[model samples]
Target chain A: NAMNSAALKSCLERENALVVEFLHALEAETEALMDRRAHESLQAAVQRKETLADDLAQLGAERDALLSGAGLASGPAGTDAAAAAHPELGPLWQALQANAAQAREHNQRNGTLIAVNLRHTQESLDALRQA
Target chain B: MNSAALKSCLERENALVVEFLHALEAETEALMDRRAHESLQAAVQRKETLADDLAQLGAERDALLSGAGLASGPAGTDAAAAAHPELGPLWQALQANAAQAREHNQRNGTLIAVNLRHTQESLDALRQ
Candidate 1:
């Protein structure tokens, strides 16, 4: 369990580092959308962010497996159990949660902005067709 | 932390849990119905906000638990429940709802994957 716990804690550290970059990319996405940057620029940002998102998801699975090593309940419950089992782990978990929360906020705003952009484009086409 | 304080924090935690459940339920509906892209997008936005807010509640619980020299995480929660009989039922209620919220969140992810496939195929149909 010690070995796995060490890995689990290491997982959190790596996740934190990854999210630092992710936080920027997400914020970058928001800025690019606001400036209505070139299509490829936006695509590039999307490509980068998509890659990081997939990596983050993969890292999360490692933590999930780490939790299961000790017969934790699995998934969210396992996450809570693993963090709770070790005092040092809890704060790291908290930090990741807080950091990820910020990313989610930025992403949510981006989603809204994209939806609005699409809606206006749709309306423009509809009006053109009517005329 | 005192029992009353713990109770309040638990109440706060439970509120966040139920609110998150609502968010998950909304996302579930959007995905399962194969709703419009805009609709699911809105649901995703709401779920993000709810999830962001939920993170802090765990910190609050951990703070109270550690302050009293008790265990952290769910273990501390169990000890707290044992000490305060009145708080026991509420804790159980929270646990059950939190469990549901967890499953719902995961289920929604799979649903989103399904929706994504259909969307890709639909786009191909229109293009070709």
Candidate 2:
């Protein structure tokens, strides 16, 4: 089985673009959250998030298909091998990982903020109910 | 030129969020303890009422923002927020509190979901 660098490159680029958009959407969500437009922002983001998720899943499947076609075993090892085979993709892969990490951190931070708000609300409710 | 209206709206919203959280916590505890489905009915209704109130307050916030020319949606709000400067701390606090609220709710939701999955798995095993 032959390794398909050109096809792999195309897949990587497409994935990168999607990741960038996903990050931007996440940023927009933060803006919405901060501006007290969470309900509206969420309403809008949910649709976009779902669409992007579908697209990402499709691309992932295709990427897996390509790897399988190229006789690479699935998982991180396979990915590493593919990258090693085509050193050009190394930086792109790194960039994708970096972006994914950033997304995760931002999402987690937002979640933490939400929890704090809820906790404070609960405290107030408890105090009022007791009074 | 005054930001009292916005500040008041934010305080009201905070109160409403707290009310909602109380209901959410009640439901969450019931779910985790495997209380009878019917036992959660009151909490569920309470949560819904609080949620409805929150929505209304949100609408009120939107109106206030609009009147102040900071209207919700896109860069305008951010730009307006920056221009006022006096209201910055209030918004900052609100934003911080709001994030905390979302995170807490999400944690509760995750707990509920995990419990549900476990229940489903147990049921499946029994059927097997």
The numbered model that scores best in TM-score is 1
Q: Report the error of model 1 at residue B119, Å.
A: 2.0
Write down the lDDT that model 2 would get: 0.44
Each predicted complex: what DockQ? 0.01, 0.02
| lDDT, candidate 1, B21-77, per-residue tens | 344334333223322443545555655654554455566566666766777777876
For candidate 2, the per-residue lDDT at A82 reads 71
Q: Candidate 2 on B4-118: residue-level lDDT in tens?
A: 3222322343333334333333333322332222233344444455455545545554554566556453243345446655544545544454565556545544444443344
Per-residue lDDT tens digits for candidate 2, residues A1-131, read: 32233332333334334333433433333332233233334334434444544554455554456567678876556657777876665665555545545544654544454454445435544554465
Global lDDT scores for all candidate models: 0.48, 0.44
